[PDB]
Amino acid sequence: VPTGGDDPTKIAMLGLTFDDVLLLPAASDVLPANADTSSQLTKKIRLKVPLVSSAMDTVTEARMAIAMARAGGMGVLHRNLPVAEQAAQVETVKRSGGLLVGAAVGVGDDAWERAMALRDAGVDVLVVDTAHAHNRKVLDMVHRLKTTVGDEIEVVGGNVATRAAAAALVEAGADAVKVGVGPGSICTTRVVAGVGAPQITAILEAVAACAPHGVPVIADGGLQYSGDIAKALAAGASTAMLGSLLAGTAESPGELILVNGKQFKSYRGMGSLGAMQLVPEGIEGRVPFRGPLSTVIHQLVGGLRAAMGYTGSATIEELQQAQFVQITAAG
Amino acid sequence: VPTGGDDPTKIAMLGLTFDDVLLLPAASDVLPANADTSSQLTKKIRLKVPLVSSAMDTVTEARMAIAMARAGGMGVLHRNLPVAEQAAQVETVKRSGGLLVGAAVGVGDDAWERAMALRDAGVDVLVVDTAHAHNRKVLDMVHRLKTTVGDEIEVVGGNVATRAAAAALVEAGADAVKVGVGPGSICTTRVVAGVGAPQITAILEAVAACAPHGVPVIADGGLQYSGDIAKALAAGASTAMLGSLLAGTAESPGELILVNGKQFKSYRGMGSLGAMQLVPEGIEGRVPFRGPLSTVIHQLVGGLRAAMGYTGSATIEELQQAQFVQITAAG
Amino acid sequence: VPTGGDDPTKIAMLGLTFDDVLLLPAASDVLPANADTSSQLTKKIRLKVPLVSSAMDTVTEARMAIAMARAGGMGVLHRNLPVAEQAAQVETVKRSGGLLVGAAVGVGDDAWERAMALRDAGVDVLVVDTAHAHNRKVLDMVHRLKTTVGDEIEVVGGNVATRAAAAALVEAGADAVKVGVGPGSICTTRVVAGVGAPQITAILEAVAACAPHGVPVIADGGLQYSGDIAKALAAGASTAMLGSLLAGTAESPGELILVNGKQFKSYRGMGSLGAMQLVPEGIEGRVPFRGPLSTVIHQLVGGLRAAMGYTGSATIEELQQAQFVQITAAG
Amino acid sequence: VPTGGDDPTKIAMLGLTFDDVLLLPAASDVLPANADTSSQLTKKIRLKVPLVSSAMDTVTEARMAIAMARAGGMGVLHRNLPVAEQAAQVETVKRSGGLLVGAAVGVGDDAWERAMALRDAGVDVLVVDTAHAHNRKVLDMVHRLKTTVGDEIEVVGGNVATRAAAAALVEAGADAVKVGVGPGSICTTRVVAGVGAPQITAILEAVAACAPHGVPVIADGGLQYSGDIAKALAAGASTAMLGSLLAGTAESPGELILVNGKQFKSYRGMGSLGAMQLVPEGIEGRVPFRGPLSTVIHQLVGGLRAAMGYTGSATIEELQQAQFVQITAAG
Ligand SMILES: O=C(Nc1cccc(Cl)c1Cl)N1CCN(S(=O)(=O)c2cccc3cnccc23)CC1
Ligand SMILES: O=C(Nc1cccc(Cl)c1Cl)N1CCN(S(=O)(=O)c2cccc3cnccc23)CC1
Ligand SMILES: O=C(Nc1cccc(Cl)c1Cl)N1CCN(S(=O)(=O)c2cccc3cnccc23)CC1
Ligand SMILES: O=C(Nc1cccc(Cl)c1Cl)N1CCN(S(=O)(=O)c2cccc3cnccc23)CC1
Ligand SMILES: O=c1[nH]cnc2c1ncn2[C@@H]1O[C@H](COP(=O)(O)O)[C@@H](O)[C@H]1O
Numbered sequence A, B, C, D: 001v002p003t004g005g006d007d008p009t010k011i012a013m014l015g016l017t018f019d020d021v022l023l024l025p026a027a028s029d030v031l032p033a034n035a036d037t038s039s040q041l042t043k044k045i046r047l048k049v050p051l052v053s054s055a056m057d058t059v060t061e062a063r064m065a066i067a068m069a070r071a072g073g074m075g076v077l078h079r080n081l082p083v084a085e086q087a088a089q090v091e092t093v094k095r096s097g098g099l100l101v102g103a104a105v106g107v108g109d110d111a112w113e114r115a116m117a118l119r120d121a122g123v124d125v126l127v128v129d130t131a132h133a134h135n136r137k138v139l140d141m142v143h144r145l146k147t148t149v150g151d152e153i154e155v156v157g158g159n160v161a162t163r164a165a166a167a168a169l170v171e172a173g174a175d176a177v178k179v180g181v182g183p184g185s186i187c188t189t190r191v192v193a194g195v196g197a198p199q200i201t202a203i204l205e206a207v208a209a210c211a212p213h214g215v216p217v218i219a220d221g222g223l224q225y226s227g228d229i230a231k232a233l234a235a236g237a238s239t240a241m242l243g244s245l246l247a248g249t250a251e252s253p254g255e256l257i258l259v260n261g262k263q264f265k266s267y268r269g270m271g272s273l274g275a276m277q278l279v280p281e282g283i284e285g286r287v288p289f290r291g292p293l294s295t296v297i298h299q300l301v302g303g304l305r306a307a308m309g310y311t312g313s314a315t316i317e318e319l320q321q322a323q324f325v326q327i328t329a330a331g
């Protein structure tokens, strides 16, 4: 073995991230303005725009969930607050029309009662929200929800970063699998635990377990540019979940911050010291202020539409078949 | 598959850019001062110097086209202005002697009338000027021009970055194929759409489709140093098109700018907000002021001549047979 | 041979460092709080926490050795002082309870008398402390110690960075093998001599010689983050030795330094000019002040515990079987 | 072909530079202080220290040549001055004892008379001094010198960077071959012409042609640290030529410069505008002031001695058999 020892499987793969690849142009009859951007969030739910907002207390409360739904995507309400308050944010969203909404739950002792209160409030999607879903307690929660409320509610499980973990969630009955262990902009799991998986390779592996069973993959974390959305979907994901890219919008929670003559908003990991209030796996930081959500979403979808034009992809299902070129450090 | 999934073709190639390679020295009888730098721009047109200026409104209007022709190259007049004005710039150039000139046209509804007005003005070369030529509307335009005015005018099509796209332009009747999707200094297509192709690999692939049919390749975008001209031609291109490297010259349009005691000129993408006046795929920037064009061209051709000496290349056709070494990040 | 010459063995391997790899998540029944972090320092000695402090005069004297033992690890007392003084630091530690302690010795003419004085003082571990253990004088010292005092004292030999060197120490009778030639934060051997071996590959190679003989490997140098501890142990090491990461603690020797409104402590190589008082192979630098040792160790072990959770490793022996993904520059 | 086109030989090799490799430690009986650092400069001439100074007008005139010889190496006098003046510097050196000295000559019309005047002055080594020796005029000059004055004078030819070019100089009768096209610290050939060859690979290739014929290789350019000397010799070179590393010494030509409270000396390429007084292939820069030559040489040889200890190399001939590990960007 060229890199050491006598076991070829010790270093199991070469992991690529978004910056390691570009989409190749292909024969096209598609105008960007005419592409169909709709895609499956879950087995039963299709969104007009393939984007959802992170379940974080500096990204998604009621106002963000309403704006995301109106723009054709969806919000996932965070769970760092009392059960009755999260349930009330669900009703606030449903009171603003027939708008789709999701909400996060954990696997702790209070997680089941939270899930039932969210169901009573009319939630459309429950997200079993963990850092490591390849675990019996998490698989059991997904299965119990699906068997109990699965006719009226779609159940998402995550997060995973390997083929085997994605396969286990499929078997447990997940309606979608969420992919991302380590890639987030505010994540320190890579340096604190030494654990992670570059996202392009993680998506390719998860899709190999999920697509043959008709289960959509949500790419969660590490997306820095509108072009990364196109890359994640071409690797086989059906939607992307965004934190940093939406945290700078007017609709996110938290105050406007002025430093050195420039405007920012606070953005913090749910594993940071501040959010937990210990060995933190996130930081508390800030992102540039970007203006209204509707305008940010227009620009992000605009980049996706351009990629669909260059690759000849009339639908997101066609984009999932596009090819990459791998690039070097120089490029 | 070491990088993920079960499909070896998903990541189709490893793409190299100019900074990834160097030309290897070889046995030589050639003095730099005695090399023959002439090369085919198109099937019928041979230039004394293998260089043309970009069709951009901060690079090429009448003054630049006149200076480029006198230096032994050619200018391509931009199309971001009324038809009658572009046609008048063509006549201005022809009034300064028997000087070669080209002009860009699109594929929109007004593109045919623009092309006919340019023909009436005495243009030598028409460039069908798009970001993605692998498309029936673009192929149809190239073919219609060649069948209509092709006896008196040479027709260039572009841009492409794959073997299959280059092959389609050849079949449509192109007299030259222009290569470059994503590499430009002011380009944001890579980050906005996630689309592109590193230029050395793009040129190697396009040449594999074009050279067997006797059709010259124009390398367009990403050239930062005089040494990159030699690299592009050794990869098999016949000429190079330059934007950033000529935008700082006296003959380019736009004002001299003074910031922090240093002189600059404005340089902007044709896909920037300013040029289009939306999801922009270019930026508005600036480049250092470089002085007269004739002097810049002397230095660029001087570097090319040095490469021809080191590689034993008496002509550009011989340089197209030179070999590379691939280098690492450290180098 | 693609990289030059006709000998495939001239460039013998591709060496990976900690930053080149991440640990992959795996199926897990393990909670971080419930993992067993105990591990073999030597054939006979098992520590509660798999960490020891460097034998350096800005890292480990009596106070550090006492604090390390109380936290469940061990200190190795430096040898840059008179024999009678080092022996007295050993007794100081033993006077603070039944605490484990080690001490460094060289291979010079005074090394044997130093070793005997340390034995008389009640030392638990002798570390034969060199930059290059693949040498007859060093192997002879290890063997002579083991045959003379080996029933009551465990003998460590180092440092090495190849399979063959580790194998030689095993044959000589070492109770543990210490790995690291070139990787230290304050090391200049790589630039002064041009010699070294990236640590992940060095650990994989040393373990291939040591594990089949039941001899533990100590990973020494280059560890910058708590996550690097998990990586070193997963590559097959049984403990890690830390210099820079503990030099900023209250218990290390040396004064608090204030520069630009920030607090630091001095940290210097044992091969720096200052420590030797010549061709130095270390620098004299500084590290940020970090507070009490007990608190730093809590955070480091916290990161290790997180890695054990993500990888499903109930013990350090299970962690030694975990898998890596290799990452690129971009990642 | 993964990187483009259909020709596997177009990208002929992967080129490594000094920063891409480290020397692996090996079994050793060698103390650094006891290593034998002597090595062949040419077929007949052996130096006590394997180092020579560059033929540059900011590195080597009489004073530097005298100091280099006394330190056990040799100086090569530059040729950017009148013939009678260069010949007088040779006699100045010979007047300071029985000291070895070399001098550069070109291949222009005045080169033969320069060579004869240097011979009359008592020069020991003539260096045919070009940027590209794979050329009939250069090969003819080497052969004519060897056949005319070869009994009393050793003849060096260079520079080359390929196996075939080195082989041609051997056939022409060279007593040593000098390797380096593009690597120098003040070189811009890589960016101006796009031509070069990373030095480790260039040395491995040149040695494959020269060592079977008993002809020594001089590694010229790109050496930045004392450790790079050990790397060049392990790749198979017999000596190293130094420019930047000796330009900062008291004995080099040119004035002490004070900028921002720090001391520097001027250092310029022989292809810079200033030296030629045009398309320059070098820059005019500065290096930190380093003090007396004897002290710099002591430190450089000290690093070499350390490498010989780590690798078990008793002589330079043994060091030429040492092995490398290739490292990544991270390392
Ligand atoms: O429950 C947790 N750890 C834990 C507890 C018991 C067993 C096991 Cl195996 C584990 Cl891993 N944590 C620690 C990590 N965080 S996090 O930083 O906020 C975070 C949240 C969501 C997505 C993440 C993706 N990758 C990194 C971290 C992410 C959630 C709470
Ligand atoms: O017509 C366009 N897009 C478009 C419209 C309809 C269908 C399709 Cl498939 C597409 Cl791609 N655009 C957007 C890009 N720009 S550009 O940025 O100014 C530009 C111009 C020329 C060379 C380019 C090389 N690579 C990147 C961009 C370049 C031209 C106008
Ligand atoms: O004894 C030494 N050299 C020496 C003497 C005789 C023969 C031989 Cl083969 C050698 Cl290598 N030295 C020089 C290096 N240092 S050091 O920098 O302080 C140092 C100490 C411990 C771990 C090291 C890991 N890698 C680099 C250097 C390290 C110790 C003293
Ligand atoms: O004679 C020259 N060029 C030339 C003239 C006629 C034919 C041919 Cl094939 C060539 Cl290449 N030059 C230009 C380069 N320089 S230089 O920059 O000062 C220089 C000097 C020595 C070592 C070099 C190593 N690699 C790069 C450049 C180096 C010498 C003068
Ligand atoms: O504290 C944390 N540490 C690591 N990952 C987190 C943390 N908080 C949230 N995440 C995840 O990071 C995603 C956002 O990543 P981003 O879009 O790159 O900023 C979220 O959707 C979570 O999956």
Ligand SMILES: O=c1[nH]cnc2c1ncn2[C@@H]1O[C@H](COP(=O)(O)O)[C@@H](O)[C@H]1O
Pocket (backbone or CB within 6 Å): B054, B055, B056, B159, B180, B183, B184, B185, B186, B187, B188, B189, B220, B221, B222, B223, B241, B242, B243, B244, B245, B268, B269, B270, B271, B272, B281, B282, B283
């Ligand atoms: O706005 C833009 N975005 C991307 N590419 C552009 C744009 N405008 C012009 N180009 C292309 O970039 C080339 C110039 O690249 P440069 O020489 O690297 O600056 C031009 O000839 C066009 O092919």
Ligand SMILES: O=c1[nH]cnc2c1ncn2[C@@H]1O[C@H](COP(=O)(O)O)[C@@H](O)[C@H]1O
Pocket (backbone or CB within 6 Å): C054, C055, C056, C159, C180, C183, C184, C185, C186, C187, C188, C189, C220, C221, C222, C223, C241, C242, C243, C244, C245, C268, C269, C270, C271, C272, C281, C282, C283
């Ligand atoms: O001066 C030196 N040069 C090279 N290595 C040293 C020196 N002093 C100590 N070391 C080694 O570097 C280790 C500490 O590395 P660190 O934890 O990365 O700072 C020590 O345990 C020694 O093995």
Ligand SMILES: O=c1[nH]cnc2c1ncn2[C@@H]1O[C@H](COP(=O)(O)O)[C@@H](O)[C@H]1O
Pocket (backbone or CB within 6 Å): D054, D055, D056, D159, D180, D183, D184, D185, D186, D187, D188, D189, D220, D221, D222, D223, D241, D242, D243, D244, D245, D268, D269, D270, D271, D272, D281, D282, D283
């Ligand atoms: O102007 C120049 N351009 C390129 N190479 C040069 C020039 N002048 C001298 N050289 C070569 O660069 C070597 C010095 O390289 P250095 O030791 O890295 O600074 C010299 O011995 C020459 O072979």
